[PDB]
Ligand binder design. Structure first.
Ligand SMILES: [Zn+2]
Ligand SMILES: [Zn+2]
Ligand SMILES: [Zn+2]
Ligand SMILES: [Zn+2]
Lengths: 39, 99, 119, 516, 534, 180, 83, 87, 35
């Protein structure tokens, strides 16, 4: 929800290269890597 | 995750695991089967050795004798399935150096 | 982490200033560059004990101590009296036990002369 | 703080096994699961009171918090809970090794059916330093027949026959081996003790020889509890550990696993959760074992509760191993550690690897041997970590400013200060390019010179997987040379092969010189 | 305290006896002998960790002197002599009963009153065995030279000839099985080859002779014709001063069983006849039959045709022993009236508990072998009635005499409502005084189509009740020293002086509370020792 | 002012290969031991010398070189009766907060060997004296009886690492200018 | 079971196929941790390719410790082997 | 090499090499693990298919030897700085 | 937590209060003796 460097509140799930990371558009620090899908 | 529609990642099986060890190569076998696949950082107690969480042992509640190591995640969950039925895999450790 | 010998030997307080000053010397010009954490403690040792001496050669430090330990076996208190209230015998009364009833000669005035010598 | 921290790196010299006690379960447990129903009808989002997917037993979703260690789903390592049975039952794993150590002891005073100078010769074949598992388990075959070929014990002389199964999973003691000498006291007591019930309801005369004494899990626990410590060494177990008694080989307490093992998977076919089969077995245990403890206290019939304690014996022997259902069959613990790629082949021996890709092949003569040709749409997905150094610094500043759209660029960046990673399609790049502390790692794209494995999917022999250099070409298929298709026995008629790219610096060097 | 209550057998009793009043270094070695059986010093050091090889021998001589272990040597043809060391179960029971022998000298030596060795005869038992072994020169060479010790030395032949001061030997410090073998092999080498007929009887020809050796060689310590010196000067009779002697457990244990059984009299009669029975009881204690029965310990108890003879001749021992069958005439002079002597003894035979029942006319005696099986079942059923409901006293007696009761006759024989019998019987499966017997009336032993039968099974109920008390003795022993670990810094101040006026409160309230523990242990020890008359 | 022969292993990152061997082992032990406490020994200040050095091993996954090395470092352990002329900068109402200025301030020493008329007076003074007073930032004599070392972490300020026991039993105790 | 000097030096003097895949394997990630090279590199990248150049002039500063199966050492400096 | 010709079946491996983590990856898994914890066994892991499950460096091939960095030093500068012991 | 006590729960009688003195000085002899 909140970044560690810019403390933004909006995150954008990027699926452009099949990584599905979670990152903000302010600075570009990923919030969670390696997603855990509900199989 | 298995499946091209499930965003893939391919299976380095058991037929292809034996082909690697026939070369004698003993460092990418460790890299292809826990680093790029299944790495996980377990901190296990030394005496009455079985794993605990962030800084505890929670069976000898002293939180003193702990070694940070790293093993595959699929052996963290074997050591809890095998522990859920009454089998206790006690771990016994040495240090790498001073043969 | 194995402590082989905890109290291996003794070292005098002068080498706590002598070898440490040679560490101050090859430490990029300390104390005069006015115009990490390891150097503050290193600085706080030098100014503490040298002021206690001030407010020198080691060969003259040795001749006074070999006369100071005129004891039979219980000597080791001769090393601690190097900067502990010099030039006084009413502090030497409170240092070592049963010396008010053992040293009743001009020894106790000669240990006054040695402790007033370097002070 | 002013206090030191210092610890050597360590290893694992070996696993060693044991069944833990009936007292170490509550040592490592932290909650208890007394109550039954998983979901409170408060109609909240996480309604779990005490005996359920408890939020301080673990956490089974990404929107919750583990109330013990802390963390949502990546920080929680999983935590154990424990149960408390109403009256004990048998372990379905140790079921064979709780009669093979019951064929050795007496059945009245419960001492091992052996004399004194004989047994000292037996464990003398244990103390010698050369003993292997080939011969350690072999010499225990002789300690067991010698207890079965000996009819009467030493300390009370009472006769002991044979004990075997009763073919649910309960065992009975065939106590009577008479040849013609029926004038034994226990046989005279047996006909004397049994003649009193012939007065009433004498219909039971067709049930004489089939009737025989039982060993229910409340007798055997109070039978194992007085066999001494001094003779443990001859029937398998050792002393000198706390859990070295034979009392801890039948269920009296059972632990509950963490919910990380048995996660509440949300199928989202409904706003209801498809709860897995492993918790609904763990709840049918705690409901049967609840009404027994309240049954004997309040008072219910003895012919009624003896099937509830026989149901719960049959239920705990399904939670472990579902082969003993004796009939859509429920998956258990043992029903997934074995099998074709349940565990140990598809989870531990052979895993699924990151940084891989799988297109078709097509021939190419115009490139050399040891160079596989790679399309560029897969060349800007498969990255490679690349630590900055003074030798390659002037290259890696020119490459981070390309970005992830032109080919020699990067996808991510991790500074030495930073902790997770930084994406590079978001934010300004030239302001991030100039700093580039010399200790950190960029993740460039694949580029021609890298070290790339390659195998056919049916791998016949050790020359089915080989390592290649790369060359980035602008079509959409894996080109390779004609001469290298003979190890892979490929045929270019539509089949496909996968590539692997190692991501250390010491496995990048070892793939060439051993598998080039 | 769940860590204790689960994984601790009688090993938890034997570990903390030596841990209580001895050093820590010996609680680890006798804990290893019980857990492993028997092992020599060459492999004892391999099992323990933290004790040097000669530091074991220094540790092993500590419990050697107090007779807390027992040794054995057996050589090999190829190897040297190997010293196998065992565990002593009777040498440490002395350390258990140790407070009770001091009050057993007083209740048995009642001829004297207002004597100036009351403070000394209480100390001689503390002198004989807290030193370990004992000999006569060790107390006469003390700080006092004469001290009228000719009275004190002649005081002890009064106190040795009454029993339990037998000269020690290799018999008391070796176990019973490792003596029986090499004499059975000596009696087998006593009879050679050159007789082919009935060789199974020839193998038993040593066995008939080794029985006569067995009761002989155990009388060699008991025999009193060589334990004292006839000396014609300055005295009349005195013990031999060159004798190494300790205390004996048996006549204490036989005196305790006799003390155990007079309390059954005070219940089955008033206190007049209870006073009558004490006098004829106490006089037969110095020669009574053996309680522990070293015949039945280890040997041919397996086969019934030998196991019958362990009480066939033993009852004939009890019936045809001259030194206990009293005439019922000399009892009047011992009480401080041959009509009332016979009349107050006539009610003993009339009561259905067979003490002073079977006899010869005119000369009556108390049988043993058919009595103590009735004492053990009488005390046990009252424990059930004491700690849980009196309905269980009704049910446990009901299934006792009515063999193999079912659930319909249990309401014919006894009379309670049906809802209340489930709430009392289900407390007896949990503790094993009843059992289950099943009849499968269908195929493959199905449980809902089956009826259940009950039984007493009069051995399993007494083993569990034995060890239900051997733990509770040791659990109370666990809170003995663990209480002395807190408030220890002033227990050293209470032992460095031989005064804060508010600290003394925190020394008495811990000391009055541990005063309760030794009284609670003695009552439970009276509840436990009844189950040792096997 | 005494040495303590201990053993330790030390790591070297591979960018310290241009610096020779003794200059780097001295550095990577300094930041491990400088201004540090030892469990149950004392406070190592700075490493004195090197006693013996072994040959550098490599963890296979790491790439650095790890040397085990034995050495002694200089550590102060005054005495169980040593005179120390420290200073003070804190006073409270149950003892006296005598802390040596400059080095460490984790010390509380009581006054339990003095006369029968001692309490606290909250008027800049210690107590009323039956006698020139003493205050902060000047040389104050105090000796040492004992010390208590614990190494506990009960996870669930009074720093319990290094605490000395002191007294002022005789005259002249409280200021060095009362004498001389 | 200790250091075995050049007199009792009884293994093959040849850098086997697994040595040069490990020495190059463990030298190369030192170059990616800012370790100093010894050789005259040209304008050149890729710390593996600068590691197998350094093996040609035999300027690796390492030593191979061959363990016999009975718990015995054996040392061989990496200049001493030839390939 | 152990005294008798013995197959590569279930019947052939339980007398050839006994080590419980390796036997779990063969056919009958759990029947080898319960009687392992009964006897309280002890296997030191040095097999190939046992250092895979734990993530440790295999012992054969290029894992057999170990690599050491030279310290290029001798005793000529390892003298102490000891002086003025007691006078 | 457990119910059902044994019935041996009595305030100590002076008939056996002297009996509890003989225990505590017995071990005080042996522990302070040789061993
Ligand atoms: Zn952000
Ligand atoms: Zn632990
Ligand atoms: Zn948690
Ligand atoms: Zn028996």
């Amino acid at each position: 929800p909140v970044c560690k460097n810019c403390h933004g509140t909006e995150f954008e799930r990027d699926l452009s290269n099949a990584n599905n990371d979670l990152v903000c558009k302010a600075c570009g620090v990923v919030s969670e890597d390696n997603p855990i899908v509900s199989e | 995750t298995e499946g091209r529609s499930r965003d893939g990642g391919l299976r380095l099986g058991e037929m292809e695991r034996d082909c690697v060890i026939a070369y004698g190569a003993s460092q990418l076998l460790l890299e292809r089967l826990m680093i790029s696949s299944d790495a996980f950082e377990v901190d296990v107690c030394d005496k009455c050795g079985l794993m605990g969480y962030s800084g505890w042992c929670t069976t000898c509640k002293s939180a003193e004798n702990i070694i940070k190591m790293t093993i595959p995640y699929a052996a963290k969950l074997l050591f809890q399935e095998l522990l859920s039925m009454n089998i206790a895999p006690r771990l016994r450790l040495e240090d790498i150096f001073q043969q | 982490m194995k402590v082989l010998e905890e109290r291996n030997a003794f070292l005098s307080d002068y080498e706590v200033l002598k070898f440490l000053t040679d560490l101050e010397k090859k430490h990029l010009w300390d104390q005069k560059s006015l115009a990490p954490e390891l150097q503050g403690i290193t600085r706080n040792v030098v100014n503490y004990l040298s002021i206690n001496k001030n407010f020198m050669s080691d060969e003259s430090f040795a001749e006074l101590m070999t006369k100071l330990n005129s004891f039979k076996l219980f000597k080791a208190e001769k090393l601690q009296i190097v900067n502990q209230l010099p030039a006084n015998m009413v502090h030497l009364y409170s240092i070592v036990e049963e010396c008010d009833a053992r040293f009743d000669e001009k020894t106790i005035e000669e240990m006054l002369e040695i402790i007033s010598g370097y002070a | 703080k002013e206090v030191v921290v210092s610890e050597t790196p360590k290893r694992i010299k070996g696993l060693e096994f044991s069944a833990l006690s009936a007292a170490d379960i509550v040592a490592q447990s932290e909650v208890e699961v007394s109550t039954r129903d998983l979901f409170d009808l408060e109609k909240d989002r996480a309604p779990k009171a005490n005996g359920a997917l408890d939020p301080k037993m673990g956490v089974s979703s990404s929107s919750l918090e583990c109330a013990t260690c802390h963390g949502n789903l990546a920080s929680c390592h999983g935590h154990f809970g424990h149960l408390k049975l109403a009256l004990p039952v048998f372990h379905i794993g140790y079921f064979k090794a709780t009669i093979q150590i019951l064929q050795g002891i007496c059945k009245n005073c419960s001492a091992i059916l052996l004399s004194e100078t004989d047994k000292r010769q037996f464990l003398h074949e244990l103390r010698r330093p050369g003993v292997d598992n080939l011969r350690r388990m072999g010499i225990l075959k002789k300690i067991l027949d010698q207890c079965k070929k000996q009819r009467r014990c030493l300390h009370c002389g009472a006769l002991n026959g044979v004990v075997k199964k009763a073919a649910a999973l309960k065992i009975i003691h065939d106590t009577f081996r008479w040849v013609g000498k029926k004038s034994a006291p226990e046989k005279d007591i047996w006909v004397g003790e049994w003649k009193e019930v012939l007065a009433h309801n004498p219909e039971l005369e067709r049930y004489v020889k089939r009737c025989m004494d039982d060993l229910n899990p409340l007798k055997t626990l109070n039978l194992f509890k007085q066999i001494k410590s001094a003779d443990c060494e001859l029937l398998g177990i050792d002393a000198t550990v706390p859990s070295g008694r034979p009392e801890t080989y039948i269920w009296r307490y059972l632990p509950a696993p963490p919910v990380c093992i048995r996660p509440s998977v949300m199928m989202q076919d409904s706003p209801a959760s498809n709860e897995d089969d492993l918790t609904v077995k763990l709840t049918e245990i705690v409901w049967t074992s609840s009404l027994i403890k309240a049954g004997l206290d309040k008072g219910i019939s003895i012919n009624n509760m003896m099937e509830h304690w026989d149901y719960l014996q049959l239920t705990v022997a399904m939670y472990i191993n579902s082969d003993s259902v004796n009939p859509k069959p429920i998956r258990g613990f043992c029903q997934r550690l074995k099998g074709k790629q349940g565990r140990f082949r598809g989870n531990l021996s052979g895993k699924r690897v990151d940084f891989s890709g799988r297109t078709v092949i097509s021939p190419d003569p115009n490139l050399s041997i040891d160079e596989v040709a790679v399309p560029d749409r897969v060349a800007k997905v498969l990255t490679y970590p690349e630590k900055v150094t003074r030798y390659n610094r002037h290259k890696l500043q020119e490459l981070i400013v390309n970005g992830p759209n032109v080919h020699p660029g990067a996808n991510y960046l991790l500074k030495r200060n930073e902790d997770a990673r930084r994406n590079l399609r978001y934010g300004d790049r030239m302001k991030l390019a100039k700093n580039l502390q010399i200790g950190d790692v960029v993740e460039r794209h694949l580029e021609d010179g890298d070290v790339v494995l390659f195998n056919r999917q049916p791998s016949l022999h050790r020359l089915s997987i080989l390592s290649h250099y790369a060359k980035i070409r602008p079509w959409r298929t894996f080109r390779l040379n004609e001469c290298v298709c003979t190890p892979y026995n490929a045929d270019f008629d539509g089949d496909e092969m996968n590539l692997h790219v190692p991501q250390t610096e010491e496995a990048r060097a070892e793939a060439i010189n051993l598998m080039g | 305290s769940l860590e204790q209550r689960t994984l601790n057998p009688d090993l938890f009793l034997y570990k903390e006896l030596v841990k209580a009043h001895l050093g820590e270094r010996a609680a680890s070695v006798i804990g290893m002998l019980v857990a492993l059986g028997r092992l020599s010093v060459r492999e004892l050091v391999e099992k323990i960790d933290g004790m040097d090889v000669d530091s074991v021998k220094t540790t092993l001589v500590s419990l050697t002197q107090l007779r807390c272990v027992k040794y054995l040597q057996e050589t090999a043809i190829s190897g040297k002599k190997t010293t196998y060391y065992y565990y002593n179960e009777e040498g440490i029971h002395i350390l258990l009963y140790s407070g009770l022998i001091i009050d057993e000298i007083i209740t048995q030596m009642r001829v004297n009153d207002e004597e100036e060795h009351k403070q000394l005869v209480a100390e001689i038992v503390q002198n004989v065995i807290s030193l370990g072994s004992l000999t006569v020169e060790d107390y006469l060479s003390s700080v006092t030279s004469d001290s009228m010790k000719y009275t004190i030395s002649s005081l002890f032949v009064q106190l040795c000839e009454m029993g339990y001061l037998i000269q020690i030997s290799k018999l008391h410090y070796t176990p019973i099985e490792d003596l029986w073998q090499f004499l059975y092999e000596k009696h087998y080498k006593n009879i050679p080859r050159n007789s082919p007929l009935s060789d199974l009887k020839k193998r038993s020809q040593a066995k008939m002779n080794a029985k006569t050796d067995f009761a002989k060689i155990i009388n060699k310590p008991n025999e009193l014709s060589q334990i004292l010196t006839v000396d014609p000067k300055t005295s009349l009779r005195i013990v031999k001063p060159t004798v190494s002697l300790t205390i004996n457990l048996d006549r204490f244990m036989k005196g305790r069983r006799s003390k155990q059984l007079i309390n059954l009299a005070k219940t089955r009669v008033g206190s007049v006849t209870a006073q009558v029975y004490k006098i004829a009881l106490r006089l037969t204690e110095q020669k009574s039959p053996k309680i522990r029965d070293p015949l039945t310990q280890t040997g041919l108890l397996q086969d019934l045709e030998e196991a019958k003879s362990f009480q066939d001749e033993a009852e004939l021992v009890e019936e045809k022993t001259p030194g206990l069958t009293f005439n019922a005439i000399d009892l009047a002079r011992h009480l401080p009236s041959a009509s009332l002597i016979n009349s107050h003894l006539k009610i003993l035979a009339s009561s259905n508990f067979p003490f002073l029942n079977e006899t010869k006319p005119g000369v009556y005696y108390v049988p043993y072998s058919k009595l103590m099986p009735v004492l053990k079942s009488s005390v046990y059923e009252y424990v059930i009635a004491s700690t849980l409901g009196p309905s269980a006293m009704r049910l446990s007696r009901c299934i006792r005499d009515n063999k193999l009761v079912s659930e319909k006759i249990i309401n014919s024989t006894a009379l309670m409502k049906e809802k209340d019998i489930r709430s009392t019987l289900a407390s007896l499966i949990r503790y094993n005084s009843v059992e289950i017997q099943e009849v499968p009336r269908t195929a493959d032993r199905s449980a809902s189509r089956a009826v259940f039968l009950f039984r007493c099974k009069e051995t399993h109920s007494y083993n569990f009740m034995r060890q239900n008390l051997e733990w509770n003795m040791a659990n109370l022993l666990f809170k003995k020293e663990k209480l002395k670990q807190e408030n220890s810094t002033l227990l050293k101040k209470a032992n460095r002086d031989d005064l804060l006026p508010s600290e003394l409160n925190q020394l008495k309230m811990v000391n009055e509370r541990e005063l309760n523990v030794f009284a609670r242990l003695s009552r439970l020890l009276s509840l436990w020792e009844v189950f040792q008359m096997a | 002012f005494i040495l303590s022969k201990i053993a330790d292993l030390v790591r070297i990152p591979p960018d310290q290969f241009h610096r020779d061997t003794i200059s780097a082992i001295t550095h990577q032990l300094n930041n491990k031991f400088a201004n540090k406490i030892i469990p149950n020994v004392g406070l190592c200040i700075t490493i004195y010398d090197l006693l013996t050095v072994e040959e550098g091993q490599l963890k296979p996954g790491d790439g650095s070189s790890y040397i085990n090395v034995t050495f002694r470092a200089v550590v102060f352990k005054p005495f169980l009766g040593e005179i120390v002329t420290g200073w003070i900068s804190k006073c409270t109402a149950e003892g006296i907060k005598v802390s040596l200025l400059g080095i460490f301030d984790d010390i509380f020493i009581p006054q339990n060997m003095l006369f029968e008329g001692c309490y606290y007076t909250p008027e800049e003074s210690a107590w009323i004296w039956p006698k020139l007073y003493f205050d902060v930032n000047e040389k104050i004599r105090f000796r040492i009886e004992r010390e208590v070392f614990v190494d506990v972490k009960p996870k669930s300020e009074k720093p319990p690492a290094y605490a000395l026991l002191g007294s002022c039993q005789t005259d002249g105790m409280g200021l060095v200018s009362w004498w001389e | 079971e200790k250091a075995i000097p050049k007199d009792q030096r009884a293994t093959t003097p040849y850098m086997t196929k697994y040595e040069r895949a490990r020495i190059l394997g463990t030298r190369a990630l030192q170059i990616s941790m800012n370790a100093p090279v010894f050789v005259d590199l040209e304008g050149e990248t890729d710390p593996l390719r600068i590691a197998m150049k350094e093996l040609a002039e035999k300027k690796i500063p390492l030593v191979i410790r061959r363990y016999l199966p009975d718990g015995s050492f054996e040392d061989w400096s990496v200049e001493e082997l030839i390939v | 090499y152990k005294g008798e010709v013995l197959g590569i079946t279930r019947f052939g491996l339980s007398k050839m090499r006994d080590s419980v983590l390796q036997l779990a990856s063969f056919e009958k898994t759990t029947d080898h693990l319960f009687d392992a914890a009964f006897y309280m066994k002890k296997d030191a892991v040095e097999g190939v298919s046992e250092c895979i499950i734990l993530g440790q460096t295999m012992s054969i091939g290029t894992g057999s030897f170990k690599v050491v960095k030279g310290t290029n030093i001798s005793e000529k500068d390892l003298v102490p700085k000891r002086c003025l012991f007691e006078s | 937590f457990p119910s059902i006590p044994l019935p041996i729960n009595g305030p100590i009688t002076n008939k056996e209060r002297s009996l509890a003195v003989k225990y505590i000085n017995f071990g005080k002899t042996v522990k302070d003796g040789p061993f």
